[PDB]
Design a protein around this motif. Structure first.
Motif, short mmCIF file in Angstrom:
data_model
loop_
_atom_site.label_atom_id
_atom_site.label_comp_id
_atom_site.label_asym_id
_atom_site.label_seq_id
_atom_site.Cartn_x
_atom_site.Cartn_y
_atom_site.Cartn_z
N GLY A 53 0.77 -1.24 0.00
CA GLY A 53 0.00 0.00 0.00
C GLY A 53 0.80 1.29 0.00
N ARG A 103 -11.03 -9.02 -6.49
CA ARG A 103 -11.42 -7.67 -6.11
C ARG A 103 -11.17 -6.70 -7.24
NH1 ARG A 103 -7.87 -5.15 -1.33
NH2 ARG A 103 -6.41 -4.89 -3.07
N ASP A 128 -8.26 -6.12 -8.64
CA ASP A 128 -6.88 -5.64 -8.74
C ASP A 128 -6.17 -6.06 -10.02
OD1 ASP A 128 -7.12 -4.45 -6.16
OD2 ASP A 128 -5.89 -6.05 -5.21
N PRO A 180 -7.09 -11.15 -2.20
CA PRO A 180 -6.17 -10.04 -1.88
C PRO A 180 -5.34 -10.36 -0.64
CG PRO A 180 -8.34 -9.50 -1.09
CD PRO A 180 -8.48 -10.84 -1.81
N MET A 181 -4.41 -11.29 -0.81
CA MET A 181 -3.53 -11.79 0.23
C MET A 181 -2.13 -11.81 -0.34
SD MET A 181 -5.60 -15.14 1.42
CE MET A 181 -5.19 -15.08 3.16
N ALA A 182 -1.17 -12.13 0.50
CA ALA A 182 0.18 -12.47 0.07
C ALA A 182 0.08 -13.55 -0.99
CB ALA A 182 1.02 -12.96 1.26
N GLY A 221 0.95 -7.75 5.45
CA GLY A 221 2.24 -7.10 5.50
C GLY A 221 3.15 -7.53 6.62
#
Ligand SMILES: O=C(O)C[C@@H]1CCC[C@H]1C(=O)c1ccccc1
Ligand SMILES: O=C(O)C[C@@H]1CCC[C@H]1C(=O)c1ccccc1
Lengths: 227, 226
Positions: free
Chosen positions: A13, A46, A48, A72-74, B145
């Motif tokens: 982000g 999503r 992306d 929307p994860m690692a 993160g």
């Protein structure tokens, strides 16, 4: 070949995608052929799509993807949740090598932070950088905490002799404040600040974003990226 | 002497202070004597006082600090704004070795993350940990993160031959959620998760906090520290 930069960041982000576009826009206006590569892309469910977003902001037409995961994860987690696998290490290095050519600037945008696993077992964008001899351009925030994250990312880079092409503050507020102003001054003492993109740059239309992009970076530094 | 532990975090706001207190409370409940040293405190104008939080939450009385800056910034920023230097390297190091004593667990709480500047010139909690032979307890989040920041911190630790005593998740959400549940499994594959403190633990009164703390850590590990 040409020049390869991985465009990494101190975390998720922080502005990695918009900076790719800005450097891509600036490099084209410097007359450089630009390809952008996104080997691992999560969050498709999503909507992306970072590559598509670079084309929209920068007009880049030379877009190369490889792996795409819905959540929307690692990448490891988005793949584990989809029943899919991570790409192989050589699949990524190859994706990049096929774009690489003399006179072309090839930006390789990672997923999240520098040490995120992109391929099994524990292959990161740092490993990818060593394999393709790339330098790392690091996107950072101006927020409280950025100096530590930045210093950590740089030390991880020097640990594997991956050169640091500089920092880019992904989003720079106007006017700044004491914490932001302080962090910027401190970031400039740790490494070269190549640009600080104005907040909301992702919302600029084509012409405004190209103007902003050309103003953001030193023209000579952009031009000096490729012989 | 005894056991010196540094309690660091991957960033600011990850719950370093509440973790210090929980480990303090647990160790005191194992019949261990605890001291906590916080060399530099910032944010004092708005009432930040992490040693007081540890005293209140855990009942520790050996609470040691050297400097307090009003601005809610990083120590070097708070110092610059106030017009006064940071403490010296020797001041922090000698304060810690003077706290250190046999039978005592001495916790050292930094400011922000591991590489933040704590003393004059550019000395970090990582340097301090080397100078006093302390291991490091790393406080982490469960949010998207956390893995990157954690691997980054453990590699910074290892680069200067500072042991990792483990990770603690400062704040565990309820209900977890997909991202937090996945990160916990991965974090436990990268290092030993010693505890995950329920979100909101920071607001408990002392009775409940001690009870929380006793159950949050493995009793045998806590005891085995000193
Ligand atoms: O590129 C980004 O950072 C935005 C992605 C948006 C969804 C996930 C995020 C992501 O790529 C990522 C990778 C590893 C850890 C945490 C997040
Ligand atoms: O311990 C914390 O992170 C809370 C402090 C609240 C005020 C500042 C913060 C702090 O110690 C710090 C140190 C270095 C960089 C960013 C913040």
């Amino acid at each position: 070949g040409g020049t390869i930069l991985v465009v990494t960041g101190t975390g998720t982000g922080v502005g990695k995608t918009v900076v790719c576009a800005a450097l891509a826009s600036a490099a084209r206006q410097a007359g450089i052929d630009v390809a952008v590569c996104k080997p691992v892309q999560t969050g498709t469910a999503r909507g992306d799509d970072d590559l598509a977003e670079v084309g929209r902001l920068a007009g880049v037409t030379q877009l190369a993807g490889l792996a795409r995961y819905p959540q929307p994860m690692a990448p490891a987690a988005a793949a584990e949740h989809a029943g899919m696998a991570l790409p192989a290490r050589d699949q990524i290095v190859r994706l990049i090598a096929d774009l690489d050519r003399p006179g072309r600037l090839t930006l390789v945008e990672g997923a999240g932070g520098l040490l995120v696993e992109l391929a099994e077992p524990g292959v990161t964008l740092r490993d990818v950088a060593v394999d393709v001899a790339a330098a790392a351009l690091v996107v950072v925030t101006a927020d409280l905490g950025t100096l530590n994250h930045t210093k950590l990312t740089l030390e991880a880079l020097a640990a594997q002799q991956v050169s640091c092409a500089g920092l880019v503050i992904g989003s720079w507020p106007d006017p700044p404040g004491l914490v932001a102003a302080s962090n910027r001054s401190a970031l400039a003492r740790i490494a070269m600040v190549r640009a600080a993109l104005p907040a909301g740059a992702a919302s600029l239309d084509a012409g405004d974003f190209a103007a902003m992009s050309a103003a953001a970076f030193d023209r000579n530094w952009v031009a000096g990226l490729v012989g």
